[PDB]
Amino acid sequence: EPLDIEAYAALYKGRTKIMRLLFIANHCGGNHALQFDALRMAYDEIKKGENTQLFREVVNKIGNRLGEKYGMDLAWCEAVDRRAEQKKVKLENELSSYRTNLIKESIRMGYNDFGDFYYACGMLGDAFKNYIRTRDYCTTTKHIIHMCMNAILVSIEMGQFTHVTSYVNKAEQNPETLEPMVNAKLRCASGLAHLELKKYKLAARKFLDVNPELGNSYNEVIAPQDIATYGGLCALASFDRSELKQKVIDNINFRNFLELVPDVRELINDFYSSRYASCLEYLASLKSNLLLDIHLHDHVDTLYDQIRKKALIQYTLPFVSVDLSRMADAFKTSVSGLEKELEALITD
Amino acid sequence: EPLDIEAYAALYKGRTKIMRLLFIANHCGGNHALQFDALRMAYDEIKKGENTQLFREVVNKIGNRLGEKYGMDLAWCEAVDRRAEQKKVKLENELSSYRTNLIKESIRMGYNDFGDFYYACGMLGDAFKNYIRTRDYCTTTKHIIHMCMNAILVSIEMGQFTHVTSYVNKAEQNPETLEPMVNAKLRCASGLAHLELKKYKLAARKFLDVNPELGNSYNEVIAPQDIATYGGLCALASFDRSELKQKVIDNINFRNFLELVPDVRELINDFYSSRYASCLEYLASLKSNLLLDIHLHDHVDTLYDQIRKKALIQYTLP
């Protein structure tokens, strides 16, 4: 089933919407309607919008192929550039005045405004730095959590998930009870970080416990559809049958995410029911779209491989809950190594 | 357990002692204590020695790294080479006379002496040719067996195990029944060739049937220790548990050999008794010295895989 990026793009809010558009355009492609659709959608989102270099990049990517409206605009670039100079100088002015006047909240907000500014104009390190500089000036829990959330966001945008894990840890270890929405977003970030660091078991454990009510709240990061897909796939590639039963099949909250992706739902059910062929057919049909996913793309093959292995082993052998770690320990390997050996045996 | 080349080398007799020290010094290395002790011993042995080709080889390999008494010796080389030439000429004259006078047994012995001479000089193909050549001069079954034993030894040193097999066959099929020790040695040769030809099951059967009274009498080729090691690992990689119980765990004669190498004995018991991690720990621990084994080296990984595979399957029994 083919992807419609109108509906997909609509799921997302900020820079990530743009990045996902560019990602789709860049690779899978070979299907160029999709490509230049994505390029066009991206062009119009970027134009909105504070970021001149991204505009230039997409303009060079489209390359006049879409006509006059999708070509280069010098007016726009110059204007945006100058207004940036202006509001920048205004910023630094105000902050010098605040630091000097010794007003805590205004210094925090000053730095934060700077972060907003560089994030917007697209310079990510400077935004991170400035967001992080607000620690000392935080009066309230809300301020600290706000700092962590921004640092998480920009870390993600720059691809440091180690950092994301750090700032999740920072915010989470705050002794104060947090709004459950905030916790939902924290669990999302940790899950995503784990996914991108290839710790799938941990990824899945995080996603499966995300608050059902999250909906689109975390839109500038993730969509409920992603939570179901990543949670489901990671679980299937990681969990033994017991844990799959406890934290997926019988997890009523997670059903709300699953209902959003019935293919993934049926596929997981197929697997738990030991219909392995059906499961694998479904994954085959899903492979293209999954390959279109900025976050999941690098993990598609590993996860598919893992699920196929677990399938082979369950199907062919004298364990349904397969005590694989017991054997791994008997053979002085990891479970994934053992899985390689076993697949060799089972298939020849 | 870290290898001591002294004990190991002391186990063997002729050319093979040397070939072993050289094989050792050539691979594992990273351990240059090992390398240097091996080179030194090789040099010392080779020097005893009719083979200046070997000598120049080890001199080059060492490259003056053992200092002044481990390098080139021109006087030694000259003396050895000259003595050889004198010898060769004497042997040529004799054999020529024997051929001229039609003296069967002298012709036979003549070609045989050339065989010996060539072997000492390090020229293996020539040696092989003369030893085989004695075939046309054989009056007796002993003669046949003598030629076979020489042919076998030289083929092993030339690493041609197809020939080893031939001369093993010839020997084995003697209408006359063979002496026990010759039989034992032949089992050893056959096992060796099977091992090189990557047929481990046959190799194992051969080695497992070797008469425990052979001891060090085959030292030019194999040691009792090697018989245990090759027998054990080959069987373990090859045999079903029935055969492994019968021919190995319950084989009392072979127990004599297995005694000599406890780690391998225990490795086999651990495998049989299905304590897998123990087994693989032993294999892990032996892997280095097995890789130093001039004959077993190439087979190590394969045998290891085979063993491991079997273990996995054993594990899946309910």
UniProtKB/Swiss-Prot annotation, chain A:
Q: What is the effect of changing G191R?
A: In fus6-T236; abolishes the interaction with CSN2 and CSN4
Where, per UniProt, does this protein localize?
A: Cytoplasm; Nucleus
Per the record, the GO terms for biological process are:
embryo development ending in seed dormancy; hyperosmotic response; protein deneddylation; protein-containing complex assembly; red, far-red light phototransduction; response to absence of light; response to salt stress
Identify the residues that the record assigns to the PCI domain, covering every copy: 199-348
List keywords of the entry alphabetically.
Cytoplasm, Developmental protein, Nucleus, Phytochrome signaling pathway, Signalosome
**This protein's GO CC annotations:** COP9 signalosome; cytoplasm
Tissue specificity note: Expressed in leaves, flowers, immature siliques, and light-grown roots.
User: What function is annotated for this protein?
Assistant: Component of the COP9 signalosome complex (CSN), a complex involved in various cellular and developmental processes such as photomorphogenesis and auxin and jasmonate responses. The CSN complex is an essential regulator of the ubiquitin (Ubl) conjugation pathway by mediating the deneddylation of the cullin subunits of SCF-type E3 ligase complexes, leading to decrease the Ubl ligase activity of SCF. It is involved in repression of photomorphogenesis in darkness by regulating the activity of COP1-containing Ubl ligase complexes.
**Domain comment, in the record's words?**
The PCI domain is necessary and sufficient for the interactions with other CSN subunits of the complex. The N-terminal part (1-211), which is not required for deneddylating activity and CSN complex formation, is nevertheless essential for other aspects of CSN complex function.
Q: How does it assemble?
A: Component of the CSN complex, probably composed of CSN1, CSN2, CSN3, CSN4, CSN5 (CSN5A or CSN5B), CSN6 (CSN6A or CSN6B), CSN7 and CSN8. Interacts with itself and (via PCI domain) with CSN7 (via PCI domain). In the CSN complex, it probably interacts directly with CSN2, CSN3, CSN4 and CSN5B. Interacts with the 26S proteasome subunit RPN6. Interacts (via N-terminal domain) with TSA1 (via C-terminal domain). Binds to the translation initiation factors TIF3C1, TIF3E1 and TIF3H1.
**What's the family?**
Belongs to the CSN1 family.
Q: What is this protein's name? A: COP9 signalosome complex subunit 1
According to its UniProt entry, this protein's organism is Arabidopsis thaliana
- The gene behind this protein is CSN1
